[PDB]
PDB file of C-alpha atoms in Angstrom:
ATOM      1  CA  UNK V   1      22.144  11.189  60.600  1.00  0.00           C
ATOM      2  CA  UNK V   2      21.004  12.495  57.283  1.00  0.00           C
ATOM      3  CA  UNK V   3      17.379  12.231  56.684  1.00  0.00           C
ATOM      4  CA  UNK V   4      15.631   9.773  53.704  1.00  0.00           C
ATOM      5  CA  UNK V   5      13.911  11.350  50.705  1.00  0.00           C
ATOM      6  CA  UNK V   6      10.444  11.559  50.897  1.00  0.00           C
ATOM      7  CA  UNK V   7       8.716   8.961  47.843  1.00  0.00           C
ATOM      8  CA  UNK V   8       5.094   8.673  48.488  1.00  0.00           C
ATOM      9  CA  UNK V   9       2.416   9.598  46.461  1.00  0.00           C
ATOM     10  CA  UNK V  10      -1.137   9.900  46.828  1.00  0.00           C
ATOM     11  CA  UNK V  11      -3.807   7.089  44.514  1.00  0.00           C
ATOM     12  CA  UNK V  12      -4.941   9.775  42.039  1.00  0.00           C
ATOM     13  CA  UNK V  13      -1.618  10.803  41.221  1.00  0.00           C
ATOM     14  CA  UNK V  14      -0.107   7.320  39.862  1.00  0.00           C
ATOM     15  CA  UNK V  15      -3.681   5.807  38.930  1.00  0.00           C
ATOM     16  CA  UNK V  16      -5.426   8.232  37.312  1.00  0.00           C
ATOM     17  CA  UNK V  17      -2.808   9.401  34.741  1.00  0.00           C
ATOM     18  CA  UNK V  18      -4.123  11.769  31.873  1.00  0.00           C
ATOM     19  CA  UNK V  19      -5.255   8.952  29.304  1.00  0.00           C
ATOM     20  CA  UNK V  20      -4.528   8.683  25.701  1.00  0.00           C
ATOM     21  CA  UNK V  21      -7.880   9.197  23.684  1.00  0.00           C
ATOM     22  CA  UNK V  22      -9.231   6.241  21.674  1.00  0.00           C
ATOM     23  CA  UNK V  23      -9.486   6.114  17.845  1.00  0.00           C
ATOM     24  CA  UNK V  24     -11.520   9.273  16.765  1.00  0.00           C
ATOM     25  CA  UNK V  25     -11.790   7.674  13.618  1.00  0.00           C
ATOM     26  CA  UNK V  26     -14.526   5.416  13.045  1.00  0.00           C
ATOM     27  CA  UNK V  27     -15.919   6.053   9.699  1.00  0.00           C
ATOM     28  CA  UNK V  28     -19.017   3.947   8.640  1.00  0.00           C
ATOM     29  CA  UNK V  29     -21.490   4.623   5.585  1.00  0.00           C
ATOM     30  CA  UNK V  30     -23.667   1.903   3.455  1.00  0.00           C
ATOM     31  CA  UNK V  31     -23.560   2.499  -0.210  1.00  0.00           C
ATOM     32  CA  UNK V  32     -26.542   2.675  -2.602  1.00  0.00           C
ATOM     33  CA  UNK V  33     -27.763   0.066  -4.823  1.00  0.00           C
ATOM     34  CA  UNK V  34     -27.950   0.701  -8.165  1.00  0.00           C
ATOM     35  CA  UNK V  35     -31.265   1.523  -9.179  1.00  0.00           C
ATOM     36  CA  UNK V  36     -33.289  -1.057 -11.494  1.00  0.00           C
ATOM     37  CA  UNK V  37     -35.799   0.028 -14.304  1.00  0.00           C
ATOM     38  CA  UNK V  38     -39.189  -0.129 -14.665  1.00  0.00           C
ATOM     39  CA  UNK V  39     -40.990  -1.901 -17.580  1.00  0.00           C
ATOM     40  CA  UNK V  40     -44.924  -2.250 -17.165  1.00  0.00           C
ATOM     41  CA  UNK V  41     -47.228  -1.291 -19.557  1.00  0.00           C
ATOM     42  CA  UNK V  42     -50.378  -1.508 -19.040  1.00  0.00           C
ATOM     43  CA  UNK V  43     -52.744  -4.549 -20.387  1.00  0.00           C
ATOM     44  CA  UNK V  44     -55.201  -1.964 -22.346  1.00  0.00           C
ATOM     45  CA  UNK V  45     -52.927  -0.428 -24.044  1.00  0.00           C
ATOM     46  CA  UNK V  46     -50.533  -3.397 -25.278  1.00  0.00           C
ATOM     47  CA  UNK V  47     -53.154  -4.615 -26.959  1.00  0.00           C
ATOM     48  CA  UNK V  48     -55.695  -2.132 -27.466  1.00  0.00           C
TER      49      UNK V  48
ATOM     50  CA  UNK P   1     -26.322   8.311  13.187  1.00  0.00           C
ATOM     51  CA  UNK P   2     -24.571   4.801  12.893  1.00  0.00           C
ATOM     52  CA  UNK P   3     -27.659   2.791  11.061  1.00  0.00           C
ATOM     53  CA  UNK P   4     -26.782  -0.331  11.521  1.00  0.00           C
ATOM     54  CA  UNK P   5     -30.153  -1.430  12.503  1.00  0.00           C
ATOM     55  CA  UNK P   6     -31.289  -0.586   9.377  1.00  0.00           C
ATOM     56  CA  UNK P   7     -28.651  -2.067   7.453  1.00  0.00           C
ATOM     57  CA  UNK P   8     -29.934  -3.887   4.337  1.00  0.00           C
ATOM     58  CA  UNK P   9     -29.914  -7.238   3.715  1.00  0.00           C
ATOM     59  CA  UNK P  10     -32.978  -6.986   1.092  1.00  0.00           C
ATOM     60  CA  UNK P  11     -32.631  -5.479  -2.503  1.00  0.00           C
ATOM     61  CA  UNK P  12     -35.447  -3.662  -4.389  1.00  0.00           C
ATOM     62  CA  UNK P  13     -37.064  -7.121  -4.831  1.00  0.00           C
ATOM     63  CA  UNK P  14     -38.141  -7.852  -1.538  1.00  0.00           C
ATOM     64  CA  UNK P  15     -36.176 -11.181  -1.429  1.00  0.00           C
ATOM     65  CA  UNK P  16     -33.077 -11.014   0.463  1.00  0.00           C
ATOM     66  CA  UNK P  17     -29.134  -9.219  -0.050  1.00  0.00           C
ATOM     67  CA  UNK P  18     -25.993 -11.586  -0.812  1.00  0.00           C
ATOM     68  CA  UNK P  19     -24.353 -12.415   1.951  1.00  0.00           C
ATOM     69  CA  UNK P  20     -16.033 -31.576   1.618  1.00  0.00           C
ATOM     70  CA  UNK P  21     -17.187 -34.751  -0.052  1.00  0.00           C
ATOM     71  CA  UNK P  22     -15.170 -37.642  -1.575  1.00  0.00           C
ATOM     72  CA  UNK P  23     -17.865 -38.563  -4.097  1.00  0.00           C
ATOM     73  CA  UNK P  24     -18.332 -42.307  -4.887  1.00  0.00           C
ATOM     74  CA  UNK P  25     -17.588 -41.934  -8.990  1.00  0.00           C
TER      75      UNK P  25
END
């Protein structure tokens, strides 16, 4: 009587597979608002 | 460094940043 092939495997070996990686790429930056100008003057000198 | 936390929502004015009806005739 031939003997059966052995298929067993231990839990690490068929759970804990080498993963895939997540997305590396996750680029995030806020822009810059456009600067406004300035336009004071001061009251002395308006007028004065 | 992800700043998200300081993400504006205000503008150089302090302010804030841009985020029916049937009428009767």
């Amino acid at each position: 009587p031939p003997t059966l092939p052995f298929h067993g495997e231990s839990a690490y070996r068929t759970d804990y597979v080498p993963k895939p990686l997540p997305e590396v790429a996750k680029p995030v930056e806020v822009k810059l608002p456009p600067t406004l100008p300035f336009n004071a003057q001061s009251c002395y000198r308006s007028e004065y | 460094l992800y700043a998200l936390r300081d993400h504006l929502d205000s503008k150089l004015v302090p302010n804030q940043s841009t985020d029916h009806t049937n009428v009767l005739s």
